[PDB]
Amino acid sequence: QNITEEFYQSTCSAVSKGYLSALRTGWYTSVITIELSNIKENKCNGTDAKVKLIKQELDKYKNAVTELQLLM
Amino acid sequence: QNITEEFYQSTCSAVSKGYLSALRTGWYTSVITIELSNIKENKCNGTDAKVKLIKQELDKYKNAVTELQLLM
Amino acid sequence: QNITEEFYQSTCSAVSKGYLSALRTGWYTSVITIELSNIKENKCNGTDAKVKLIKQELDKYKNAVTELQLLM
Amino acid sequence: ASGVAVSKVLHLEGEVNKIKSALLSTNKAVVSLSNGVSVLTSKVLDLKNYIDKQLLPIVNKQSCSISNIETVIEFQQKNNRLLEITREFSVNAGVTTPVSTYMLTNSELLSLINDMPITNDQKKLMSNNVQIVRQQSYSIMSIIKEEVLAYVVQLPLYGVIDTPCWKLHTSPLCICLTRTDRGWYCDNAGSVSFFPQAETCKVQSNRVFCDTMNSLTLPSEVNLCNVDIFNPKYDCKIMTSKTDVSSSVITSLGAIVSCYGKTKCTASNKNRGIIKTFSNGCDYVSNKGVDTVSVGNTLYYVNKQEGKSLYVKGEPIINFYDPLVFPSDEFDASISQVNEKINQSLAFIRKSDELLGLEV
Amino acid sequence: SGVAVSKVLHLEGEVNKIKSALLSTNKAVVSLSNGVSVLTSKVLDLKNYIDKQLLPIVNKQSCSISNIETVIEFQQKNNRLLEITREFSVNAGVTTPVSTYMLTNSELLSLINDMPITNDQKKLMSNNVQIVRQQSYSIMSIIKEEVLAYVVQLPLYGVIDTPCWKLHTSPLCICLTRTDRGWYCDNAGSVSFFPQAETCKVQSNRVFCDTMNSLTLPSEVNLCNVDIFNPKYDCKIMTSKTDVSSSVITSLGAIVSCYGKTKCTASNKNRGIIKTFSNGCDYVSNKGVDTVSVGNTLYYVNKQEGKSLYVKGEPIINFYDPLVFPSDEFDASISQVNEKINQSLAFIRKSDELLG
Amino acid sequence: ASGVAVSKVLHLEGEVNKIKSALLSTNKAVVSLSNGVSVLTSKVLDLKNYIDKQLLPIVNKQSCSISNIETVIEFQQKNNRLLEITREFSVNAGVTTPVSTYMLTNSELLSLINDMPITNDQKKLMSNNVQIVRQQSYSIMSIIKEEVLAYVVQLPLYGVIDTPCWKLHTSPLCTTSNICLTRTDRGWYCDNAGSVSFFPQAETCKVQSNRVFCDTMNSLTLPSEVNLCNVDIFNPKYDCKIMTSKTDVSSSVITSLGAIVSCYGKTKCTASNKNRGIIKTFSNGCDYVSNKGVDTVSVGNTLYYVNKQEGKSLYVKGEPIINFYDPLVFPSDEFDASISQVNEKINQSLAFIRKSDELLGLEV
Description:
heterohexamer, A: alpha+beta, Rhinovirus 14, subunit 4, Single alpha-helices involved in coiled-coils or other helix-helix interfaces, elongated, D: alpha+beta, four-stranded antiparallel sheet, 6 helices, 19 strands, viral protein, six-helix bundle, membrane fusion
């Protein structure tokens, strides 16, 4: 225990001594980048013809990326 | 660059001139609504009889909706 | 309607009377715990030999848990 | 008749040779059939070997992938909640607020509440405002291992309840004065508690929820500051100005207007437009009758402006599972016909042996 | 005796042989009957395998794949509803900023061109969708199993295109420090003053403040920037009877207040220490100075550019190898088997023809 | 013209006619079998056509759906992290704080830290408090395309370190009509180059153990004389920032290692303990109570908690999930034995014919 506390009756107040500082005075900026593991869709007749999962997944994703593109 | 900065030595202080304001003084409220693309569960014997995915997914969902219903 | 509002012209100011308080002065702490429904991986040759989904899912998870273990 | 008898024996010397040929053709007939059946047999064997070496293994790899998949999908369903909690702690670096419904479900929150060291009046209050309670709570990750996760929830305890609160707003008055003690005020044990940051108080209906942590304690005399600024019983916290000034403050049930100098102000209404022009002084306007207020060129909204409804439709998703059925019965009928033909083929032989005569 | 018994009797030594011949031919036919009986049962058992053992497994699999697909398609066709419930769940039913799940760009613009404001305001918001989203709330309002409903609450701007400015202050030396730091924007003939940093967002030369917790001042406060004891507005100041020294980092530079026995210096990432400050108030530009150093504490006048990181990804591949059957060859062998039966019936028809 | 001979001839008709019939039956026997095999053959053909036209195509559609599915599931696993990052930027409109572990992993954060332009003492400090560093950081989306995402991480740099800090609490004080005082400079205080830095918003300072992390951005710089304000308010060396009141007043402030109580006027206060209940009654004046011995304090009717109240443990159990995969096996060996028997029967069927031809004779 490095942290203690003195109480000054003279001035109704308590102080908490014994901390060690670290004052932010600047910013460090690094540019991180991340690639997509893309999916090459293999075309063929599946179980249900109306269900194109591979596509509906990319569409979903391409969309999320579009919405963000529009914040800038 | 429209933004510049004058420094007054007389009064230790810097001012940053050349911004353009937009003060919020009101609120605009719109009511958005969203329907659920429900799943009609087709009943039949699958691969594992203990695995009712369609159901366990709806249950999970109906639950999330219940927890929220209870915040009001 | 319990809430009303008096306006004092004498002191340019409005007061909103008729609320009922609840002042936080303490904290109650409870320790919640949650077990993992683990997956026992059944080993056998699947459709694509390069696709070990069960494993890649655990790995993903064991990772999330490692990153958190490192915040302490 | 000596000569017919030779004609007979000629029919016959001559019969035996014909029945010899007859039988030679019958044998070749049987050799042809042997071959058909040898071929057919090999084609049945190859058929089975297709099913066993080619088809069967593919049907098992698929049973295995489906098992793998299902398991994964069921991992995410049966750990829906553990998995949401790790996402939350991951995004916020291990300390979230408010306490989500993944972190603490309603039946659990109530569980904890009816266990807090507080009166039934407090327990009842919290039970109705679970929303506010969640937003004044923290969730602090404490122990995390692969097979179990652990985290402290930290809910707030209220030291007092059911006390008169009130929220004070102020605008300029005209030299000029402006009261600088805006904010919430709640009665505490014989004194007034004063909360000056808007961030520390939540309000739901007629109910207020404040945090005493960064609050100032005042005597009940501060309330005389609402009628007289130079009240001799408490020196009011004020801010002066030697020059004309004019603005608007939007309160909860209306809006104050301070219109001094050469500035022009006006309260309007969404039906009749401009319905009042303010002269030099301090007026107050109710949100029942006024909808906007206009100081100089800047426009204040006394009420939320109702807007355009939006609606996103959804369609039921359908699953097409068309099962594969086999013509079992008809088939058995043809195989039953094939056994019938073999039964009577052995009859015809047994009949023939009988004329030779082997009996069997 | 009138017939030659020798032709008759000889014609028998043959007859016994052809009797034997035919006995072997019968046994031959009985052997074949048995083969075919066995073969027949093995075809029947083959079919019963396909119908009782294989077929049902192929259906259970058609069913599981349907179940799975449906579930996966549930999460794709409700991607958005599902994100919104996660958001409300995490934040207990009130979020900020207004996510792109909560409100898409074409919808935000939709709402904007419907707000009761001028085209100048509508245009402004249309360009800063980011800031507008961060000053908005999203309040869950009605939630049922098959439909979700929630109020979006966007901000309305009562005034626009007014001169703003941000004021910084440092000590001066007894000592003085101006205590009215923060943003200032011109409102109808007066200055609005926003003293919490949390209430103002800034994007480019553009500022977005919330009048809610703002103070209204006369245009005379600006004389406080040149003269503190300005007789036309009493400046909000904070005194000190002892020497004091620090640094404030502004947007286009940094102020330094170096008094007493304290040593300060502005440095530059290329030449190191390029200036030492004497007793008084100096100001330094972020164009030429990169760090400033009061005593032992070090201030960064500019963001320090750092190490790039890059996480590579690989295309994922899907191996689907279809199962094909040798249909044609097969039919050729069955066509051969029918050919053999056709001519087996020919040889019998030939044989019957010799018998009458 | 006749005799026995005429008998012998009728006799040769005798056997020969029987062996004619014998053979007619044997032929019909062979025609029956031909038909069986014709039918059987068609039933094998239809069996294959079932497998090729009906069964096979369904087994391929399934191989395809399983490939599709797997791919999709593997998309979400091999982009787990890219996908979390887009969710984060989507929810917060492109600027998040704190810096998540999806946005920046531990080995990366440490990577960046041992590259910052700071001393080993600072690099070491941040390395231990990765939690606080993540909460004082931002993550700002910068470039976003379909196949690649890019975003600036913005970590804090500490200009000074290892300096004495302290946190100051205050409560009211009162002459015993009476006047009251309350010090209005509550908050954190850290030593900066010969002066004190003072942080007055609680939001700007984080604290972890004996360690404090503040943001100089909205801080006030004070002379080291402000510390005499802790013992004397009218200290002639620094005019203390104070707030007065001409009327009695009383409250409680809860500090980190205890709690202050200001009990003046006709108000009744008391410190209690979770074992003995009320263990002290405060008279007019300023007292201070330690969180070691006191558990709650009670000014008038309002109740202050000097310590967190330990509560009920909750526990949510889970069960192992099991996967039932029952493979399909074929009786290969037995089958081959029956087909081997069928080839054996055909072999000896040809034997019996070769034997028969030999008596006619055709040598083979």
